[PDB]
Each structure stands twice: as structure tokens, then as C-alpha cells.
Design a binder for this molecule. Sequence first.
Ligand code: CL
Ligand code: CL
Ligand code: NA
Ligand code: RU
Ligand code: RU
Ligand code: RU
Ligand code: RU
Length: 129
Amino acid sequence: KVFGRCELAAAMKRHGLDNYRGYSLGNWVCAAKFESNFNTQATNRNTDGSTDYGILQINSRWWCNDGRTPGSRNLCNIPCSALLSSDITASVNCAKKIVSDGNGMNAWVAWRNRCKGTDVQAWIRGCRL
Ligand SMILES: [Cl-]
Ligand SMILES: [Cl-]
Ligand code: NA
Ligand SMILES: [Ru+3]
Ligand SMILES: [Ru+3]
Ligand SMILES: [Ru+3]
Ligand SMILES: [Ru+3]
């Protein structure tokens, strides 16, 4: 599924991300934009052989099982395919674990480089939330 910006903002809010670990909703929407262009089915293979999955490009090295990332963990206890669903539940629940992990949203390189410190509220401007 490719979400609209306000559509995704509303779904993320409904799934409990607004101010989760202190990150306002616009941080999550910005991160999704630059990670996946709001496409739940986004995947990207990394040089280490791990793969990033879904709207927040969650990586198989640590967070999900794809059966093809040797030595990796599955800390969210899910198949990576779960992160590609039109229903964002799996992605959201896994992201909550990731963002609680110590480095906050810096875990998402695209967030650090393209959202952190910017007017992220603009990503939810005009949305009914
Ligand atoms: Cl594996
Ligand atoms: Cl933090
Ligand atoms: Na894994
Ligand atoms: Ru809010
Ligand atoms: Ru990545
Ligand atoms: Ru939902
Ligand atoms: Ru503003």
C-alpha cells in the first residue's frame, strides 16, 4: 500500500506513535517518507546482506526474521514479511521497540540525516488528527 501523507499520519496516531518516547507524530511521518516514500512494500538490500522492510525500513540484522541474514536476530519476533502489510501494526509495534533501544530515532539513518532538527510538524500540517 502506498499511503497518503495525512492518511499515514492518522494511522500512526491511531497506532500510538504520537509522542512515543517523546517523538511527535511529524518525526514518524518524515521518517516514513524518506525511508519508504510511504510504501509498505518497500524493501532494500544492504551491503552486509541484511534487508530493510516496509514503511520504516526495519532491518533484518536485528529486528525481524527473513531466513537469509546469517547470524542475525529477530528482536521483534516477527517474519520480516509482516512489515510489508497494508496494516501497519507490525511495523509500528517493532518501531516502538527500536526507538526504545537507546539511540531513539537515530536508529533510522534517514531520520537523523533528513528529519532531525527540521520543522517536522510540517509533515502533519493540514491533516485531520
Ligand atoms: Cl536469518
Ligand atoms: Cl530519545
Ligand atoms: Na533476522
Ligand atoms: Ru500530537
Ligand atoms: Ru537501512
Ligand atoms: Ru490500523
Ligand atoms: Ru512550522
